[PDB]
């Protein structure tokens, strides 16, 4: 085993993974600008790209075309970045080679798969141009990662959450329009004056599943971004912050009770009151915080889902059917766009005849059917039969006449 | 020819000689072994024999996998994730392979369910005290080079390389 040559091949593969993503960014730099604009709302320390260049889809001078496709390219870039970091972490931790190369030297074969394969499997499977994804993400589709209502990280599915809220309320007075208005609160509004109670068994069972689905939709929308780093930052912000502050009510506990002062608010967790709430409702409060963070991250997507639900509610039946058909056509599409009758009676043309040799081709009249045996595609029929184009092969119109061919008698 | 999900789907899935579901990826000459996650643990055996794989690594998660026949290959190394990837693998036939180093068979010691060892016509078994070293490294292995291990063989193998 050659560890230094393996490290050199890993460095060449890392350079090829950088260059393949550079070629994809030069082909369509709009995805990188959209990912930078999405990550600017999450991490503030990172520098932002140029606004005019991101609007015109350009890096330095050349404006790229518009490219489902953005989600597929983000998933392929995330897979390439996962492959690049794995190959980096694999390598993070002469005379005998030349003498063993002469063994079995008489080999009539071509060996040109050393470093070209890493670029070929990462270049943005296809024969010439059929898919914008690479060979590693050729089977990747957004249908198994997003629903029909979201349409490749463009909207959110809130109808199942509205029906779950109606089932938790155990009535039919909850409409589609009220759920999007009630879920708009989820900094201390949803903990003290929300639409449902903070410790209800019917409400919280749907709320935890809704927060998990919102976190999954946010991860599907920002799969190109650092999802683990964003989760670590959201956990560290909740660990650091005492976040809910009031002028007279001071600090509240997510217990659903306030404290008289910050000296009492710190000592309330050491007593028997807040400790039981922190031991029995840590997961519910963490799910509520994750749902609020996902709603703040995808508040534009939540507003787009609310606008689509309002358009579907205010539209007619035909307009709603056309909107559903347009959403289905957007969701289920590829990423990259691409004489008299005496002639008919007294000539035999009233009866049609098919010949099995010419792919069972049907012709009108017996004259064309017997004129199949000197033709072009029917001559390919005898070529498929294997009998030569002779009079005995012409005398038969079936496929079974090839058993009496030239290789039958002599 | 490197293995892929299309080749795994086009591989034959039928009953083996001990009535087990198998994936027949043999005769592929793949230099890197991968794409094992497309089977979804529907094959208890993986027959990738007479291949060109050098390092026995890159296997995906397979809870129902029990046999990995990679014999008559150029397998001179084994990956470190053998117990993490194939903890239920009981048979690993590497007969007439490129197993030479004693440290290449050290990664097969972590497989607790491994019982059948067929490493004949290889340079690892031709080394001095090779069967004693294999019995010392793998006490859960019952069959090694088509021979059973007894308590006297375990007491003989417990002395060297302890």
């Amino acid at each position: 085993e050659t560890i230094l040559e393996q490290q050199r091949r890993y460095h060449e593969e890392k350079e090829r993974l950088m260059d393949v993503m550079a070629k994809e960014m030069l082909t369509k730099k709009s995805t990188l600008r959209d990912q930078i604009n999405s990550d600017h709302r999450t991490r503030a320390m990172q520098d932002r790209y140029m606004e005019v260049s991101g609007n015109l889809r350009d890096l330095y001078d050349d404006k790229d075309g518009l490219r489902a496709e953005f989600y597929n390219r983000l998933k392929q870039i995330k897979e390439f970045h996962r492959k690049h970091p794995n190959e980096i972490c694999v390598p993070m931790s002469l005379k005998a080679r030349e003498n063993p190369s002469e063994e079995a030297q008489n080999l009539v074969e071509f060996t040109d798969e050393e470093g070209y394969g890493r670029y070929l499997d990462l270049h943005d499977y296809i024969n010439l141009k059929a898919s914008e994804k690479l060979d590693y993400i050729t089977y990747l589709s957004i249908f198994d990662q997003l629903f029909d209502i979201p349409k490749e990280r463009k909207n959110a599915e809130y109808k199942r959450y509205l029906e779950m809220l109606l089932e938790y309320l155990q009535d039919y007075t909850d409409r589609v329009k009220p759920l999007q208005d009630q879920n708009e609160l989820f900094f201390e509004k949803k903990w003290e004056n929300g639409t449902f109670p903070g410790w209800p068994k019917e409400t919280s069972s749907a709320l935890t599943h809704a927060g998990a689905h919102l976190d999954l939709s946010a991860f599907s929308s920002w799969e190109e971004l650092a999802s683990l780093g964003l989760d670590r930052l959201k956990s560290a912000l909740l660990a650091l912050g005492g976040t809910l502050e009031e002028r007279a009510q001071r600090l509240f506990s997510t217990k659903s009770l306030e404290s008289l002062d910050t000296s009492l608010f710190a000592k309330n967790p050491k007593s028997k009151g807040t400790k039981r709430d922190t031991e029995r409702n840590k997961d519910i409060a963490f799910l509520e915080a994750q749902i609020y963070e996902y709603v703040e991250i995808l508040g534009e997507q939540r507003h787009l889902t609310h606008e689509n639900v309002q358009r579907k509610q205010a539209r007619t039946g035909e307009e709603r059917e056309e909107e559903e058909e347009e959403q289905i056509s957007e969701s289920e599409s590829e990423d990259e766009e691409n004489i008299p009758y005496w002639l008919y009676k007294l000539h035999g043309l009233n009866i049609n005849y098919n010949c099995e040799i010419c792919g069972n081709y049907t012709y009108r009249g017996p004259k064309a059917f017997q004129r199949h045996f000197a033709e072009w595609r029917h001559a390919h029929g005898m070529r498929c039969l294997g009998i030569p184009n002779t009079a005995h092969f012409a005398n038969v119109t079936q496929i079974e006449d090839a058993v009496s061919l030239w290789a039958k008698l002599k | 020819v490197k293995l892929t999900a299309e080749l795994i789907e086009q591989a034959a899935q039928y009953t083996n000689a001990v009535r087990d579901r198998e994936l027949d990826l043999r005769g592929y000459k793949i230099p890197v072994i991968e794409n094992l996650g497309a089977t979804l643990d529907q094959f208890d055996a993986i027959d990738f024999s007479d291949n060109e794989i050098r390092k026995l690594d890159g296997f995906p998660l397979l809870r129902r996998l029990k046999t990995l026949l990679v014999n008559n290959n150029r397998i001179c190394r084994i990956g470190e994730g053998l117990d993490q990837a194939l903890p239920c693998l009981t048979e690993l036939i590497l007969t007439n392979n490129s197993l030479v180093e004693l440290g290449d068979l050290d990664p097969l010691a972590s497989l607790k369910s491994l019982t059948y060892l067929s490493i004949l016509r290889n340079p690892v078994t031709n080394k001095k005290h090779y069967r004693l070293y294999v019995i010392y490294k793998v006490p859960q292995v019952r069959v090694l080079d088509f021979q059973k291990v007894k308590l006297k063989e375990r007491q003989e193998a417990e002395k060297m390389f302890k």
């Binding site: - | 009535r19 087990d20 579901r21 529907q42 208890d44």
Partner: protein
């Protein structure tokens, strides 16, 4: 019924049948009946104790059949 019509098209694909006794047989079904009776060839049967065996041909009738798990392509 709708489920009786949908279960009969599950032949030729890799599907599983879980009986009321705890036996889960997953394999290629040769044919399926409307009363959740399925005959399969070259299947793997898992018991309640975790043991897995291979059967060349099996037939689970609907008298003690609990459920049938088919592929996700038939759900759409």
């Amino acid at each position: 019924g709708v489920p009786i019509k949908v279960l009969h098209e599950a032949e030729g694909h890799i599907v599983t049948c879980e009986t009321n006794t705890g036996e889960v047989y997953r394999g290629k079904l040769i044919e399926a009946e409307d009363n959740m009776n399925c005959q399969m060839s070259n299947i793997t049967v898992t018991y309640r104790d975790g043991r897995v065996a291979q059967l060349e041909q099996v037939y689970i009738r609907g008298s003690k059949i609990r459920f049938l798990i088919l592929p996700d392509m038939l759900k759409n």
